[PDB]
């Protein structure tokens, strides 16, 4: 049989290629991204990971974007500027996907946007999958 | 602490608001749907669920769209025309999501699209979540 996996592991869009959508993660205790390429690339596309927090005007609307910091692992060295980044390599085929997640939470909102909005950035899609509901 | 949920439960965009994208469910043994709203609705939006067979000219490209049939449960009525359909009601708020699924697999590709394209339809987003892989 097959199940209603959307009940327990919902997913929301984060970057459809033209616009970014802040995604609320407060109600869930885990998450992770998922990158897909719809057409062959031409050059590496780096991505920036931002996070928001509740605005003063309305406690249910995100505030301005804040860049997520880096936490070095025990067997590595910190980034040049100490901020997290994502790089999709040139070798990714149109028929494959990638998945990666940040080690820490920080605020109750998150989003991902490319460093530069160009013709290469339109060739990618990003989705966020939750896991585990605290309510 | 945190997990790379994207490795075990990948998700793919199905309806970004203006275009429909086929999703390959062949490699995974279960899946589901997740609907979310981005702006207030005014009239119920019905959705059509399809499946595609492999294309004749190239095995790695989907073929023409075919509409999923219905399967009644233990006790209950079949659809009026015998096909599967999904309806998003008015009461859904912008801050909530709805989940559903299909009891049978049929073809290797799956798809979804609204019955009509208009202002109300463009305000919805759909995503497909896969469970554990088998390759």
């Amino acid at each position: 049989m097959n199940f209603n996996v959307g009940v327990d592991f919902p997913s929301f869009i984060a970057w459809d290629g033209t616009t970014s959508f802040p995604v609320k993660i407060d109600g869930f205790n885990q998450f992770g991204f998922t990158f897909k390429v719809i057409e062959e690339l031409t050059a590496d596309v780096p991505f920036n990971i931002f996070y928001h927090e509740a605005s003063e005007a309305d406690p249910c609307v995100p505030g301005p974007a804040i860049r997520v910091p880096d936490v070095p692992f025990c067997d590595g060295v910190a980034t040049a500027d100490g901020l997290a980044t994502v790089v999709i390599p040139e070798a990714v085929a149109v028929d494959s996907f990638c998945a990666g997640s940040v080690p820490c939470f920080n605020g109750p909102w998150i989003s991902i946007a490319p460093v530069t909005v160009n013709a290469d950035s339109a060739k990618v899609q990003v989705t966020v999958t939750m896991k585990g509901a605290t309510r | 602490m945190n997990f790379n949920v994207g490795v075990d439960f990948p998700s793919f965009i199905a309806w970004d608001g203006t275009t429909s994208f086929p999703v390959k469910i062949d490699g995974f043994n279960q899946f589901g749907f997740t609907f979310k709203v981005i702006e207030e609705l005014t009239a119920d939006v019905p959705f059509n669920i399809f499946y595609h067979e492999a294309s004749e000219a190239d095995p790695c490209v989907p073929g023409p769209a075919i509409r999923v049939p219905d399967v009644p449960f233990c006790d209950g009525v079949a659809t009026a025309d015998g096909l599967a359909t999904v309806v998003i009601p008015e009461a859904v708020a912008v801050d909530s999501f709805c989940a559903g699924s299909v009891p049978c697999f049929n073809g290797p590709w799956i798809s979804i699209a609204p019955v009509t394209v208009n202002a109300d339809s463009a305000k919805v987003q759909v995503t497909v979540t896969m469970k554990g892989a088998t390759r």
């Binding site: - | 062949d26 697999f105 049929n106 073809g107 290797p108």
Partner: protein
């Protein structure tokens, strides 16, 4: 005076076995177990063609030859345990009846009773697999040539 209930039980079990065997080899994953030959994940080799015409006109018709079989069988890695091959009885018959320039055979050269019983421990023969010859109607002398992309045999 006969046990029709037991007969039907046996018939149902036999049908289950026969359908299961076709699955695991050709079934698709939607409602049946996915078969290896339908999944098509094993690396594939492609027999070399032959110019059956004249040098001034390259025809390049498909063909099948004994040394192609030899190369295929010898190309399998030795690391992966003990290999066994699977194929069709018509293909085995075609393979075992080839002759060289002098008219004598080149597989089982001096054996008067060559038969699949001799090589049963390395070669498994089942008729449920695709048959490139299509009932001994292709590949022979004076007949239409093979069809490109046809399945011949698998080893694993």
């Amino acid at each position: 005076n006969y046990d029709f209930l037991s007969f039907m039980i046996g018939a149902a079990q036999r049908s289950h076995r026969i359908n299961r065997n076709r699955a695991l080899m050709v079934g698709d994953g939607i409602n049946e177990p996915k078969g290896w030959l339908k999944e098509d994940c094993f690396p594939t080799f492609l027999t070399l063609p032959v110019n059956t015409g004249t040098p001034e006109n390259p025809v390049q018709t498909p063909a099948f030859l004994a040394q192609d079989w030899r190369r295929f069988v010898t190309s399998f890695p030795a690391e992966y345990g003990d290999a066994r091959s699977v194929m069709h009885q018509n293909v085995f018959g075609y393979l075992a009846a080839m002759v060289d320039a002098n008219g004598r055979f080149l597989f089982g050269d001096g054996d008067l009773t060559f038969s699949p019983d001799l090589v049963r421990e390395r070669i498994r023969i089942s008729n449920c697999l695709p048959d490139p010859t299509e009932g001994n109607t292709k590949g022979g002398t004076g007949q239409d040539a093979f069809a490109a992309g046809s399945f011949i045999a698998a080893q694993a």
